[PDB]
Design a protein around this motif. Structure first.
Motif, PDB file in Angstrom:
ATOM      1  N   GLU C   4       0.987  -1.146  -0.003  1.00  0.00           N
ATOM      2  CA  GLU C   4       0.114  -0.031  -0.022  1.00  0.00           C
ATOM      3  C   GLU C   4       0.947   1.036   0.018  1.00  0.00           C
ATOM      4  N   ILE C   5       1.148   1.713  -1.086  1.00  0.00           N
ATOM      5  CA  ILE C   5       2.052   2.907  -1.527  1.00  0.00           C
ATOM      6  C   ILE C   5       1.352   4.274  -0.989  1.00  0.00           C
ATOM      7  N   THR C   6       2.071   4.853   0.073  1.00  0.00           N
ATOM      8  CA  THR C   6       1.842   6.386   0.718  1.00  0.00           C
ATOM      9  C   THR C   6       1.669   7.149  -0.473  1.00  0.00           C
ATOM     10  N   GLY C   7       1.790   8.564   0.154  1.00  0.00           N
ATOM     11  CA  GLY C   7       1.915   9.544  -0.702  1.00  0.00           C
ATOM     12  C   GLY C   7       1.500  10.912   0.034  1.00  0.00           C
ATOM     13  N   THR C   8       1.818  11.923  -0.556  1.00  0.00           N
ATOM     14  CA  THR C   8       1.671  13.362  -0.228  1.00  0.00           C
ATOM     15  C   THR C   8       1.449  14.232  -1.345  1.00  0.00           C
ATOM     16  N   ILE C   9       0.114  14.511  -1.918  1.00  0.00           N
ATOM     17  CA  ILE C   9       0.071  15.251  -2.834  1.00  0.00           C
ATOM     18  C   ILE C   9      -0.138  16.762  -2.560  1.00  0.00           C
ATOM     19  N   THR C  10       0.837  17.386  -2.929  1.00  0.00           N
ATOM     20  CA  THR C  10       0.880  18.893  -2.703  1.00  0.00           C
ATOM     21  C   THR C  10       0.492  19.596  -3.872  1.00  0.00           C
ATOM     22  N   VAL C  11      -0.603  20.462  -3.725  1.00  0.00           N
ATOM     23  CA  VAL C  11      -0.959  21.439  -4.749  1.00  0.00           C
ATOM     24  C   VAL C  11       0.093  22.478  -5.143  1.00  0.00           C
ATOM     25  N   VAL C  12       0.413  23.050  -5.989  1.00  0.00           N
ATOM     26  CA  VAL C  12       1.373  23.966  -6.521  1.00  0.00           C
ATOM     27  C   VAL C  12       0.854  25.121  -7.244  1.00  0.00           C
ATOM     28  N   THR C  13      -0.093  24.955  -7.975  1.00  0.00           N
ATOM     29  CA  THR C  13      -1.217  25.826  -8.495  1.00  0.00           C
ATOM     30  C   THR C  13      -2.572  25.432  -7.885  1.00  0.00           C
ATOM     31  N   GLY C  14      -3.445  26.221  -8.156  1.00  0.00           N
ATOM     32  CA  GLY C  14      -4.886  25.952  -7.770  1.00  0.00           C
ATOM     33  C   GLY C  14      -5.442  25.032  -8.435  1.00  0.00           C
ATOM     34  N   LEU C  15      -6.086  24.068  -7.636  1.00  0.00           N
ATOM     35  CA  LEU C  15      -6.774  22.988  -8.206  1.00  0.00           C
ATOM     36  C   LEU C  15      -8.373  22.987  -8.013  1.00  0.00           C
ATOM     37  N   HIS C  16      -9.162  22.517  -9.162  1.00  0.00           N
ATOM     38  CA  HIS C  16     -10.464  22.869  -9.424  1.00  0.00           C
ATOM     39  C   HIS C  16     -10.970  21.628  -9.871  1.00  0.00           C
ATOM     40  N   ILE C  17     -11.455  20.545  -9.061  1.00  0.00           N
ATOM     41  CA  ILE C  17     -12.036  19.125  -9.249  1.00  0.00           C
ATOM     42  C   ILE C  17     -13.496  19.467  -9.163  1.00  0.00           C
ATOM     43  N   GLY C  18     -14.241  19.715 -10.510  1.00  0.00           N
ATOM     44  CA  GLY C  18     -15.665  20.444 -10.694  1.00  0.00           C
ATOM     45  C   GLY C  18     -16.714  20.076  -9.914  1.00  0.00           C
ATOM     46  N   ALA C  19     -16.996  18.875  -9.596  1.00  0.00           N
ATOM     47  CA  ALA C  19     -18.164  18.256  -8.593  1.00  0.00           C
ATOM     48  C   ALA C  19     -19.275  19.127  -8.740  1.00  0.00           C
TER      49      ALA C  19
END
Lengths: 801, 296, 218
Positions: C4-19
């Motif tokens: 189970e590979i972990t991770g830490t995703i850091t936004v570096v510009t702004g992110l817009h996941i519509g929803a």
């Protein structure tokens, strides 16, 4: 042709209110009322005869006219003790009919100045049925105007209505339309017992001013049949070859006998049939299967009638799959009761497996338990109607057992291990998502034969012309029904040659109770379809394009009669004609009067600019306790309060409601279009005052008085009005605003509130009214509930544009 | 025999009923045991499945909610003696579960209803989550609307299981390694952590101790259905589905359409449960669980 | 354990996941925080890694059902279905505190946009809602020990350390590419460059050290 005297022995009230020149009482009016018009004679109604001994004229001409003869308890002497009428005439059947009716219906109210008799009148109106409800007494008067299906809805009035001609030349000309077809046909018990509901709904049956008359003609005319056609199917099984002997010594036979049977049947699972649609059919089949479930519903009582030939007044209650039913307490009917319940259920396992299951409870009913006894004081009249609750609470615990063992064990293991047509699950439907049918994949989606059938309904059923229909017997084309029947939809304009056939199991018509001619034995239905499919109400809206949902149920309707009469006057008013009245008005408010408040509305605080701009919404089912409307979000949110402002003008402060309105996109699925708006009437039904509304979320839960006043007409009628003249101004400014109302629990948000407020004025606008325009919005900020109304007012303008 | 109390951390999950956009809080065990015959091929060798195809010597409950420290055992379908007002008559059917004690007070109309309904919204929220569909060919992508259940931050699903401790020891051999449960589990849903705790002995199997309330959507044999129905307070569901698994690699077809009884239903007499088989056409047997477990 | 590979995703510009505030972000309806859904991290990487492993050798793939093996080994399908070997953790925010203690107030800023029609030079404004560009998300993904179910009667084919390292070089190029591309919507405009950080292989003891170097080289 042996039950004919059940209805027409009360025709002596309104003919002298129309001044047709008769004399004598209600026995003397009606026994010559059907002598002046029915025989196609052109004589004057002022000199008609009394009594003829003709040997050759039989029941069809004599005792049809002599089916009334004598009905009231004071003139029992002449028809018997002078030999004026024999036992083989239905007037004796009609004598005990009104006697057991008015003996259990007619009681003078609790006034100060009593001993008042009801006699010949030509001025008196009916009064409100909702007078006795609650611990207050209203004095609102039902004006006896015309009510055969015109716009608007008719409302109670406080003043005394002026006695005119125009409505009363209209009533008698309506009686010129359908009381000339009184002949040996089906129009006896099916035609007359519906088209007189609306005409005689505001007309009283009495004269007395020591009482406040709430029961009309029709709620007594139903009970003349529902206690008269009931006992005829009790009659020959009890041993009567002479009707006099059952009223000469055994006129007090019902001290402790049981000659009535109070029954019900409910289709448990109406809502969880309509709200499982996963794909396309969200737009069309949501209304059609609700139209299906209400269309066999009226047919479902109709096979309990077609076995015995009872009245459609035996359903005293009707609406929402439920129909209370009074029967004789014989055993032929009780056996053929369980023939009806089981065999229609036995049909249901072929089409709808574990969704619909109907079941009938039973209470054997006496006759003295309804009527207020002589010398019933406080500790004596109170115990008379506890059993009147005991025939309902111990009728609910009849079907609190049938709804727990719904199928026999020899029945389910037919279906517990089966795949019908033996085929594969590559063919599996989308809408009803079953496998057993060969999936006739039309319109590029795997839809079953039922879902194929409902697509053929909406080609004509939600259009505004083909609202007529037909139930034939068990044929191939149409919608399948229990007890050997199909169900179809068509028009009866040029297709009466297919409506004059004996292969019609049940016949109906639309909302419009059509006198003069016959377009079917109509009932109260939903015809408010502005446009056919759900997508046509997000395709036009200047502003947001959001399909708005509305569901709304009247609260506490289980306590409508069990504890809705017994708080004022210690409950002597509990009777069948006083409890079949509000369930005869709710079959017009929620089934026909909603067409007025939708086709031509009044309140328009979002849209405006036209008084009769029609509501672009569409009601799912107009019926009974629950109203379900879906359209654009704009027209619904005004109408969803506006219909309630046709509701607080009837109960006038006693019955409460809580609604639910949400906004959704077009392709949104139905199975969460009714599990989330089931929190919007699920949170404001959890209000301590129970009379409220919840918009868009469970944290907006507002009272009905807090919504049209504080939110829209105070706060929304503050915001978009300073730039009413600049109507296209920045709503790109106003979505800054309700960030701050979320961070209102911080101190500097006060500073940023006034900061952005005077970031709008300057030298490029009219600034005569800006100090107060921010100060109104500045005082609203500090209070922890003033801004709660404000967030919704801000939301209305950004969602209006 | 012992029994096993299974505490989870189910944050989001999706046990559908008739599609995907809805959900259910309960997992009728024909959905759970069918996982144990498809999440055992992914650890055993089709010998662990073949060890437990059609034995039914192990009695396990369903996946029912728990809010904090109290099991939310189901609302039984017994006739209430609601001699009180008709609002709390209607308020019962708006209540699906209740804690472990109040049932005897519940059945006679002698209980509160505006706390049990007030812990309905302490279970968790019936959420939704919009997603966007396939680039079908080269055309414009659709959405697909898929709806779920979300628990509160202190909830999950519970389980009670008993039987032969070797074939019970192979359940906890499997469950310490069974992945995301629920239906739509290749996305983030249905993931949890199974933990063991000692059971409440207030919930013993009263198979004949005059408390004939089950804790599993179950079924007897077809003949013995005529015996346990004269005073059965039962409801019928569908336990259908699709089949399309390895060693069955064809076009996906369905299970056979069965209708088991309810899961908190109260009966007249004791009964037995057995593994019904739902394979209609094709190679390997697929089978529904139907082996109940009872309650005081 | 599983891999189970972990991770830490850091936004570096702004992110817009519509929803689909008119166009919100994915709002976790419990905490009203921003999340990253499990299918906007899966169903994007298929549109990349079926154009890096595929579409080297002139492969079109007009549907997601005819994709190559180490795609459909990891993502599964409706026709062949090797295995669903990648189940992704639906992930949400790590530090709302230090994001707001260092100055933020809203956690979802609004960006403005225009649309100049080139017929009359008219501005048509538009409002766009992103995530804060320091919104550090935690992350994990689950590869299994994966006793493979053989659809043929070649009974019980468990993969050893041979075939599994090929799929570690799949997600390496799965997330080397995603650091050099998108995550969100309204694209070709700078929305939501991310940066995966603190990746670790997580569960034999001999195997693990080479499992790092695919994913450490992204």
């Amino acid at each position: 042709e042996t039950v004919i005297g059940c209805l027409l022995h009360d025709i002596g009230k309104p003919v002298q209110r129309a001044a047709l020149g008769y004399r004598g009482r209600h026995s003397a009016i009606g026994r010559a009322f059907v002598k002046k018009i029915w025989l196609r004679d052109g004589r004057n109604p002022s000199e008609f005869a009394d009594e003829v001994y003709e040997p050759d004229i039989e029941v069809f001409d004599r005792r049809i006219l002599d089916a009334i003869s004598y009905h009231h308890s004071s003139a029992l002497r002449t028809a018997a003790e002078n030999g004026r009428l024999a036992a083989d005439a239905p007037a004796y059947v009609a004598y005990i009919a009104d006697n057991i009716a008015a003996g259990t219906d007619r009681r003078k109210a609790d006034s100060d100045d009593g001993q008042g008799a009801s006699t010949w009148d030509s001025d008196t109106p009916l009064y409100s049925v909702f007078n006795r409800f609650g611990a207050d007494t209203a004095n609102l008067t039902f004006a006896p105007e015309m009510l055969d299906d015109r716009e608007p809805m008719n409302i109670p009035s406080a003043r005394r209505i002026e006695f005119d001609k125009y409505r009363y030349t209209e009533i008698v000309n309506k009686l010129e339309a359908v009381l000339v077809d009184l002949e040996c046909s089906d129009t006896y018990l099916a035609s007359l017992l519906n088209v007189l509901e609306a005409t005689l709904s505001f007309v009283p049956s009495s004269t007395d001013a020591s009482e406040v008359v709430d029961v009309s003609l029709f709620d007594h005319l139903k009970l003349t049949g529902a206690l008269g056609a009931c006992i005829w199917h009790y009659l020959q099984a009890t041993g009567q070859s002479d009707f006099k002997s059952a009223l000469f010594d055994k006129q007090d036979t019902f001290y402790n006998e049981k000659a009535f049977l109070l029954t019900t049947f409910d289709v448990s699972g109406i809502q969880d049939f309509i709200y499982t649609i996963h794909s396309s059919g969200a737009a069309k089949m949501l209304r059609a299967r609700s139209f299906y479930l209400e269309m066999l519903t009226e047919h479902l009582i109709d096979e309990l009638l077609a076995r015995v030939g009872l009245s459609r007044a035996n359903l005293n209650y009707s609406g929402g799959g439920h129909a209370y039913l009074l029967l004789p307490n014989t055993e032929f009917a009780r056996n053929s009761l369980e023939e009806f319940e089981r065999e229609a259920n036995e049909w249901l396992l072929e089409n709808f497996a574990t969704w619909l299951f109907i079941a009938t409870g039973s209470v054997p009913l006496a006759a003295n338990d309804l009527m207020r006894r002589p010398n019933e004081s406080g500790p004596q009249a109170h115990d008379r109607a506890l059993r009147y609750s005991g025939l309902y609470r111990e009728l609910s615990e009849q079907l609190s057992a049938k709804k727990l063992a719904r199928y026999s064990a020899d029945q389910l293991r037919e279906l517990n291990s089966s795949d019908h047509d033996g085929q594969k699950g590559d063919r599996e439907c989308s809408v009803c998502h079953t496998v057993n049918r060969t999936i006739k994949t039309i319109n590029d989606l795997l839809l079953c034969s039922l879902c194929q059938a409902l697509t053929a309904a909406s080609q004509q059923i939600q259009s505004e012309s083909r609202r007529f229909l037909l139930i034939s017997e068990e044929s191939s084309d149409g919608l399948p029904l229990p007890f050997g029947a199909t169900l179809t939809f068509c028009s009866e304009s040029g297709a009466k040659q297919a409506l004059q056939q004996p292969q019609t199991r049940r016949l109906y018509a639309k909302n419009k109770f059509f006198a003069g001619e016959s377009l079917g034995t109509g009932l109260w239905v939903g015809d408010y379809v502005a446009q056919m499919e759900f997508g046509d109400y997000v395709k036009r809206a200047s502003g947001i394009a959001r399909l708005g949902v509305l569901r709304l149920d009247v609260d506490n309707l289980g306590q409508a009669f069990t504890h809705g009469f017994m708080k004022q006057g210690n409950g002597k008013f509990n009777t069948i004609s006083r409890t079949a009245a509000f369930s005869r008005m709710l079959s017009l408010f929620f089934r026909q009067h909603i067409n007025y408040v939708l086709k031509h509305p009044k309140l328009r605080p979002l849209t405006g600019d036209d008084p009769e701009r029609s509501r672009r919404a569409t009601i799912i089912y107009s019926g009974g306790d629950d109203v379900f409307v879906v359209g654009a979000w704009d027209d619904v949110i005004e109408f969803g309060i506006e219909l309630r402002e046709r509701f607080h003008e009837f109960t006038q402060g006693k019955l409460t409601v809580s609604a639910g309105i949400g906004m959704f996109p077009d392709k949104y699925p139905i199975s969460v279009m009714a599990r989330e708006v089931g929190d919007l009437e699920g949170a404001a039904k959890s209000l301590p005052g129970k009379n409220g509304v919840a918009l868009f979320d469970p944290e907006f839960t507002f009272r009905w008085d807090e919504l049209l006043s504080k939110v829209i007409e105070e706060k929304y009628r503050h915001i978009a009005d300073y730039f009413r003249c600049n109507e296209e101004r920045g709503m790109a400014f106003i979505y800054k605003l309700l960030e701050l109302l979320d961070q209102r629990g911080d101190r500097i948000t006060e500073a940023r509130w006034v900061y952005f407020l005077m970031r709008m004025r300057g030298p490029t606008d009219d600034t005569t009214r800006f100090q107060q325009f921010a100060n109104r919005l500045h005082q609203w900020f500090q209070d922890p509930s003033d801004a709660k109304q404000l967030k919704t007012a801000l939301h209305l303008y950004i969602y209006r544009n | 025999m012992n029994s096993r109390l299974f505490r989870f951390d189910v944050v989001r999950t999706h046990f559908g009923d008739h599609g995907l956009e809805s959900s259910t809080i309960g997992c009728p065990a024909d959905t759970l045991y069918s996982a144990l015959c498809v999440e055992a091929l992914r650890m055993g060798g089709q010998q662990l499945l073949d060890e437990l195809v059609a034995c039914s010597t192990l009695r396990l409950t369903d996946l029912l909610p728990y809010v904090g420290p109290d099991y939310l055992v189901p609302k039984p379908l017994k006739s209430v003696r609601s001699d009180s007002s008709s609002l709390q008559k209607k308020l019962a059917k708006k209540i699906g579960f209740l804690p472990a004690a109040q049932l005897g007070s519940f059945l006679d109309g002698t209980a509160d209803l505006d706390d049990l309904a007030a812990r309905q919204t302490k279970i968790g929220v019936h959420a939704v989550s919009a997603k966007a569909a396939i680039h079908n060919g080269k055309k414009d992508a659709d959405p697909y609307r898929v709806g779920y259940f979300r628990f509160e931050p202190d909830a999950g699903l519970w389980l009670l299981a008993t039987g032969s401790e070797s074939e019970l020891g192979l359940l906890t051999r499997l469950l310490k390694g069974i992945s995301a449960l629920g239906g739509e589990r290749t996305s983030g849903f249905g993931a949890f952590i199974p933990t063991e705790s000692e059971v409440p002995a207030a919930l013993t199997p009263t198979t004949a101790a005059a408390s004939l309330m089950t804790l599993t959507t179950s079924l007897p044999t077809d003949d013995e259905l005529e015996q346990a129905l004269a005073g059965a307070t039962y409801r019928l569901v569908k336990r259908s589905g699709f089949v399309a698994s390895a060693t069955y690699a064809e076009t996906p077809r369905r299970k056979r359409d069965i209708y088991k009884l309810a899961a908190g239903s109260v009966f007249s007499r004791p009964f037995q449960g057995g593994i019904l088989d739902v394979s209609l056409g094709g190679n390997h047997p697929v089978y529904s669980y139907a082996r109940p477990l009872f309650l005081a | 354990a599983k891999i189970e590979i972990t991770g830490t995703i850091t936004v570096v510009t702004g992110l817009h996941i519509g929803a689909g505030v008119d166009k919100p972000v994915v709002r976790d309806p419990l905490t009203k925080w921003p999340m990253i859904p499990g299918t906007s991290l899966k169903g994007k990487v298929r549109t990349l890694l079926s154009r890096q492993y595929g579409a080297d050798t002139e492969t079109f793939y007009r549907k997601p059902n005819d994709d190559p093996a180490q795609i459909r080994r990891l993502f599964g399908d409706t026709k062949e279905y090797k295995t669903g070997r990648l189940v992704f953790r639906d992930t949400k925010l790590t530090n709302k505190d230090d994001l707001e203690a260092r100055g933020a107030k809203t956690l979802t800023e609004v960006k403005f946009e225009n649309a100049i029609n080139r017929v009359t030079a008219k501005a048509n404004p538009r409002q766009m809602e992103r995530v804060i560009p320091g919104s550090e998300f935690a992350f994990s993904l689950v590869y299994e020990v994966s006793f493979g179910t053989p659809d043929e009667e070649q009974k019980a084919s468990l993969p050893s350390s041979d075939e599994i390292i090929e799929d570690f070089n799949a997600i390496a190029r799965g997330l080397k590419l995603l650091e050099l591309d998108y995550l969100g919507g309204s694209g070709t405009r700078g929305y939501g460059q991310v940066k995966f950080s603190d990746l670790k292989a997580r569960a034999d003891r001999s195997l693990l050290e080479m499992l790092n170097h695919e994913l450490a080289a992204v």
